[PDB]
Design a protein around this ligand. Sequence first.
Ligand SMILES: CC(=O)c1cc(-c2ccccn2)c2cc(N3CCOCC3)ccn12
Length: 116
Amino acid sequence: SMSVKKPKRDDSKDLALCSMILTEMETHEDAWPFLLPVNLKLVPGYKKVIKKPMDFSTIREKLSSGQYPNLETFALDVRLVFDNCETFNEDDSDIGRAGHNMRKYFEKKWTDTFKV
Ligand SMILES: CC(=O)c1cc(-c2ccccn2)c2cc(N3CCOCC3)ccn12
């Protein structure tokens, strides 16, 4: 509360650590469905069904331009890429499998870096 804080966490490396994490996502073999915005002209249903499209290049533009105020906001956009993927793709498809694989990959790094 007012004049009563928890001990200050060093948050000065978070930008760099999120960039590193995102670079590891971008270069994974199964990232290809997520690297660019889905082409809303070319994919029927996407625009109406997916209320908040998201992708790695958009995440990278946001991060590099100071648009995440904190860690939580960066991890919300990352998860949204996979939440979207699940909403739109069957689990038993190449892209649905990529999505599951990339979330797992993300969450491990996310825990190793900021939890453990
Ligand atoms: C993320 C997602 O749902 C997605 C990502 C792709 C994609 C990204 C890069 C290159 C090729 N495909 C894609 C492609 C889709 N289609 C391919 C063309 O036929 C219509 C469906 C449907 C959904 N998607």
